[PDB]
Amino acid sequence: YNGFTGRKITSQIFIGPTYYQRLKHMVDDKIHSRARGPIQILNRQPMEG
Amino acid sequence: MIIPVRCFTCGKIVGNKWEAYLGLLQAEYTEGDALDALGLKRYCCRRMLLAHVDLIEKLLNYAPLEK
Amino acid sequence: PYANQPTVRITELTDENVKFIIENTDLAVANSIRRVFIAEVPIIAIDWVQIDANSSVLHDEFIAHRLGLIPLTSDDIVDKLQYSRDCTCEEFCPECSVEFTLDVRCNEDQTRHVTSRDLISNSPRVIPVTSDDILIVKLRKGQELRLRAYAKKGFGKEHAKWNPTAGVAFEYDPDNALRHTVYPKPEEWPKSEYSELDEDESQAPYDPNGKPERFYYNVESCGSLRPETIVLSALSGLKKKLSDLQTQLSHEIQSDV
Amino acid sequence: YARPEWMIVTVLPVPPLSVRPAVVMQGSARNQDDLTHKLADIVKINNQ
Amino acid sequence: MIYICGECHTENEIKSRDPIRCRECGYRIMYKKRTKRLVVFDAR
RNA sequence: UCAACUUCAUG
Ligand SMILES: CO[C@@H]1[C@H](O)[C@H](n2cnc3c(=O)nc(N)[nH]c32)O[C@H]1COP(=O)(O)OP(=O)(O)OP(=O)(O)O
Ligand SMILES: [Zn+2]
Ligand SMILES: [Zn+2]
Ligand SMILES: [Zn+2]
């Protein structure tokens, strides 16, 4: 049954208990942004990482 | 690590049923019959007890940092 | 041009369950009543935890999580209690919250099962649905858990800890006569418990003029609120949301004029 | 712009310190660039 | 501060610039011990 | 708040 409207979904949906794993890759570890931050000595270009 | 309070899918309290489940398993009851005796009806709640691994007992073997 | 008059028939009433049928109502109204059951019925649950000492294996925020999920009796005073935002006093006070305390130490050799029974409330009306018990943590000898908690009014839209219900079963058209679900092979499909069809007939004949009515509900209580009062509070809360909407609408219409 | 004799190295250009920065650790020590070490070797051999 | 011993679990008070050795057991691993200030946890 | 190197992962 559709959660928002309550109407039965016309196509019957495949449901069951499946085992799922949470991989170590998480968005908080990957989000990054740069704006005139630290700069390397030799190249005098923005740093890496 | 320890039996979750409340089934994830619906929210029925399953935290109070682990010790009773283990006792019923010791009695003779099959896993399904014990789950029925505890009142777990939907397969979402039965997954909570059936698939639970109680690691808190293994962690309690290590001695506490402060005694 | 006006609202239909709904009718209710309660089939089952037990301390944990209410099975009822609402007839002559719209699908939207019925679904939103179910939605309010799940998300917009106020309840009392722990939302502030301060752990003085936690030497248990579980970390502090794990303990706080488990304490928040513990149901608390909220039958009468949840309507009296105010939200923390509404209360004039800074932080929390008897009117906006309830205080619990836990002081457990495993002095004995045998493992001590800290349960919801060990939580002690300052007001007798809120108790952790103890009258087994929910296991907060297991303590080895020499391990101690001491904490103070404050429980506040809230509803399930904020957090699932405030859900007053376990599973709301909602069904309409038990025998498919509006063809809202089109079975590829109707015979393979199990009959509903509310189905009135004979065993030979898999589906009722298509009703071209039909509209979803006679909705069947089974509301299971989590123990915090009685299953009857979950439904009554949901109806009242939906009515209050509509009335607030109407007040704001009238004010803005007056402003436009 | 280029005479064949100028190809043979009689004067070795020593790059500025910007080209070969001094690599500082904790103020306790200053490692030197590979170019600085190679130039030190060249100076030693030239003096010998 | 006061450091709890790793092995014998007895609090010992070690001044700054002092070797990290528990009295009466000699273990060289100490732990800083929980803070007096209290942190609020939302049960969520 | 350095730099080289390696390895391991992500597309
Ligand atoms: C579809 O093409 C992409 C891109 O070409 C880019 N890519 C990825 N790895 C590399 C690499 O090593 N070097 C370069 N240059 N590009 C690379 O990744 C390719 C696919 O790889 P995949 O086949 O694993 O994608 P699934 O089919 O596996 O997707 P699921 O169902 O998991 O989501
Ligand atoms: Zn469940
Ligand atoms: Zn207050
Ligand atoms: Zn020691």
Domain boundaries, chain B: 1-67
Kindly list the partner chains of chain B, i.e. chains with 3 or more CB atom pairs below 8 Å. Answer: A, C, E
Nucleotide with the nearest C1' to A30 CA:
F10
Query: How many angstroms is it from C56 CA to the middle of ligand 4?
Result: 21
Residues in chain C: 257
Q: How far apart are CA C34 and CA C44, in angstroms?
A: 20
- 3-state DSSP call for residue A29? helix
Tokens matching residue A35: 């704006």
Q: Which homologous superfamily does the CATH classification assign to the domain defined by B1-67?
A: Homeodomain-like (1.10.10.60)
Measured from the Cβ of residue B32, the count of other Cβ atoms closer than 10 Å reads: 11
* Contact (Cβ atoms closer than 8 angstroms) between residue C105 and residue C94: no
- HSE (side-chain half, CA atoms, 13 Å) at C173: 22
Contacts of E33 in chain B (CB under 8 A): 66
Strands, E assignment, chain C:
7-14, 17-23, 43-54, 97-105, 112-115, 120-121, 135-139, 144-154, 165-171, 215-221
Q: What residues of C are in the B interface, CB distance below 8 Å? A: 55, 57-58, 66, 69-71, 111, 113, 116, 129, 132-135, 137-138, 140-143, 160, 163, 165-167, 220, 222-223
Q: How far apart are CA C82 and CA C79, in angstroms?
A: 8
Tokens matching residue E33: 């011990």
E4 → chain B, closest CA residue: B66
Contact between A10 and C181 using a beta-carbon 8 Å cutoff? yes
Pick from C66, C133, C160: CB nearest B16:
C133
Contacts of B5 in chain E (CB under 8 A): none
Query: How many angstroms is it from B65 CA to the middle of ligand 4?
Result: 11
* Contact (Cβ atoms closer than 8 angstroms) between residue C223 and residue C116: no
Nearest alpha carbon to residue C155 among C219, C79, C217:
C79
Tokens matching residue A13: 């949906």
Q: How far apart are CA C118 and CA C121, in angstroms?
A: 10
Q: How far apart are CA C142 and CA C151, in angstroms?
A: 29
Ligand nearest to the CA of C89: 3
Query: How many angstroms is it from C251 CA to the middle of ligand 4?
Result: 72
Tokens matching residue C226: 């009685």
DSSP track, B22-62: HHHHHHT--HHHHHHHHT--SHHHHHHHHT----HHHHTTS
Contacts of B6 in chain E (CB under 8 A): none
Nearest alpha carbon to residue C92 among C41, C156, C49:
C49
Q: Which residues pair with C242 in a beta bridge?
A: none
For chain B, the maximum distance between any two Cα atoms, rounded to a whole number of angstroms, is: 43
Smallest CA–CA separation between B66 and chain E, in Å? 5
Q: If 0-12 CB within 10 Å is exposed, 13-18 middle and 19+ buried, where does residue C163 land?
A: buried
* Contact (Cβ atoms closer than 8 angstroms) between residue C38 and residue C3: no
Q: How far apart are CA A17 and CA A6, in angstroms?
A: 23
Contact between B10 and C138 using a beta-carbon 8 Å cutoff? no
Is residue E3 part of an annotated ligand binding site? no
Q: How far apart are CA C116 and CA C71, in angstroms?
A: 9
Query: How many angstroms is it from C154 CA to the middle of ligand 2?
Result: 22
In chain E, the number of structural domains is: 1
Domains of chain C: 1-42+161-257 (3.30.1360.10), 43-160 (2.170.120.12)
Give B63-67's long-range contacts (Cβ < 8 A, gap of 24+): B63/C140, B63/C142, B63/E9, B64/C55, B64/C140, B64/C141, B64/C142, B64/C143, B64/E9, B65/C55, B65/E4, B65/E9, B65/E31, B66/C55, B66/C142, B66/E4, B66/E9, B66/E11, B66/E33, B67/C142, B67/E9
Q: How far apart are CA C95 and CA D47, in angstroms?
A: 90
DSSP state of A45: S
* Contact (Cβ atoms closer than 8 angstroms) between residue C103 and residue C161: no
Nearest alpha carbon to residue C223 among C166, C160, C168:
C166
Resolution to one decimal, Å: 2.7
Contacts of A17 in chain B (CB under 8 A): 43-44, 47
Range of the domain at E12: 1-44
Q: With left for phi above 0 and alpha for psi between -120 and 50, is residue B21 left, alpha or beta?
A: alpha
CATH of the domain at E22: 2.20.28.30
- HSE (side-chain half, CA atoms, 13 Å) at C20: 22
How do the residues of chain A divide into helix, strand and coil, expressed in percent and rounded to 5?
A: 10, 5, 90
CB-contacted nucleotides of strand F (7 Å) = 1-3, 10
Contact between C161 and E43 using a beta-carbon 8 Å cutoff? yes
Ligand nearest to the CA of A23: 1
Q: How far apart are CA E11 and CA E29, in angstroms?
A: 12
* Protein CA E28 to sugar C1' F3 (Å): 34
Ligand nearest to the CA of B40: 2
Pick from E9, E34, E43: CB nearest C49:
E43
Name residues whose C-beta falls within 8 Å of residue C80's C-beta, 6 or more positions apart in sequence.
Answer: none
* Contact (Cβ atoms closer than 8 angstroms) between residue C100 and residue C149: yes
